[PDB]
């Protein structure tokens, strides 16, 4: 939950606010790592693989 | 018209928002 991202009352939408996946860089994100991973990897095969729904 | 048409089609002017999909509030 992030109460600063509360969509206004003038937004109908379907139920969510599917945004540009490249918009993740402007939001807070939990910094969870994998305590067992020897070497992990992101994926950007056409562009960076990320979702961002803002209910 | 000069070759700054790339600025009136994209980038610095025309308000092209590269984060909003085409046909926003429309078909897929």
């Amino acid at each position: 939950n992030d109460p600063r991202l509360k969509l206004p009352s003038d937004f109908r939408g379907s139920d969510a606010l599917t945004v540009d996946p490249t918009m993740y860089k402007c939001l807070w994100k939990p910094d969870l790592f994998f305590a067992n991973e020897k070497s992990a990897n992101f994926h950007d095969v056409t562009q960076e693989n990320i979702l961002l729904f803002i209910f | 018209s000069p070759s700054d048409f790339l600025d009136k089609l994209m980038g610095r002017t025309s308000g092209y928002d590269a984060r909003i999909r085409p046909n926003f509030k429309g078909p897929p």
Epitope: R12, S14, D15 | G26, P27
Partner: antibody, heavy 115, light 102 residues
Framework: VQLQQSGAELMKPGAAVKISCKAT????????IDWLKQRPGHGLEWIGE????????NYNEKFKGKATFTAEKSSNTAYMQLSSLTSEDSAVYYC???????????WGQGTTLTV | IVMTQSHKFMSTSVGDRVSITCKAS??????VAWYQQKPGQSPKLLIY???TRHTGVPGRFTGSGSGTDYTLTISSVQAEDLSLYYC?????????FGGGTK
């Protein structure tokens, strides 16, 4: 791809019935299985959806609690349970499925319910 | 969203052009599907996204309209086109249909 439901059902008030949706042609944990309600006199109505593998469900706000979606990968079938049956529940219940969108292009033969 | 069909029953002769209006409640602008349910069978899909056809549908069914006001269209009504026609929005989560037209 095909969806083979159970047979007709007859229940009494206060009871609860469970309607199945036997997916014959694909793994049940593959696609969303939607559930609809057709009450005569009125029109169709969307109950909800269940992805039979991840146990995720998105019920309609009118059918919260009234309907419960479950799945069982042992036989590739998606279930729905109607609790607190009343005379308003007299209708036909379908289990649609939309593959390439939020439309309903795969349907079930129907399961008549009569409280 | 509250999809609406203001004509429960329509009259048409074999070989006519009839338009079925499904006036949406808010702006979906493409999210509309049209179903046909003969008596005693599941409603089969005809149109989705208000202008596309389903695999195995006759070419006389044509969807149109956008925004709020939508419309189905049958160019040459055959004998099998005497059934119930449901419109359906697939834009939001609660997927109302809109009653039905006959």
């Amino acid at each position: 791809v095909q969806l083979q439901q159970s047979g007709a059902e007859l229940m009494k008030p206060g009871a609860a019935v469970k309607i199945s949706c036997k997916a014959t042609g694909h793994t049940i944990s593959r696609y969303w299985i939607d559930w609809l309600k057709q009450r005569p006199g009125h029109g169709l109505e969307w109950i909800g959806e269940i992805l039979p593998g991840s146990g995720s469900t998105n019920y309609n706000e009118k059918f919260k609690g009234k309907a419960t979606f479950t799945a069982e990968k042992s036989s590739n079938t998606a279930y729905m349970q109607l609790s607190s049956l009343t005379s308003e529940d007299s209708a036909v219940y379908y289990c649609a499925m939309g593959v390439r969108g939020n439309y309903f292009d795969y349907w079930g033969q129907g399961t008549t319910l009569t409280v | 969203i509250v999809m609406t069909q203001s004509h429960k029953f329509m009259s048409t002769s074999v070989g006519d052009r009839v338009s079925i209006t499904c006036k949406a409640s808010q702006d979906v602008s493409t999210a509309v599907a049209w179903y046909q349910q003969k008596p005693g069978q599941s409603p089969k899909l005809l149109i989705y996204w208000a202008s596309t056809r389903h695999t195995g549908v006759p070419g006389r069914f044509t969807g149109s309209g956008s925004g709020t006001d939508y419309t189905l269209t049958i160019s040459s009504v055959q004998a099998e086109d005497l059934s119930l026609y449901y419109c359906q929005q697939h834009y939001s989560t609660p997927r109302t249909f809109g009653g039905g037209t006959k």
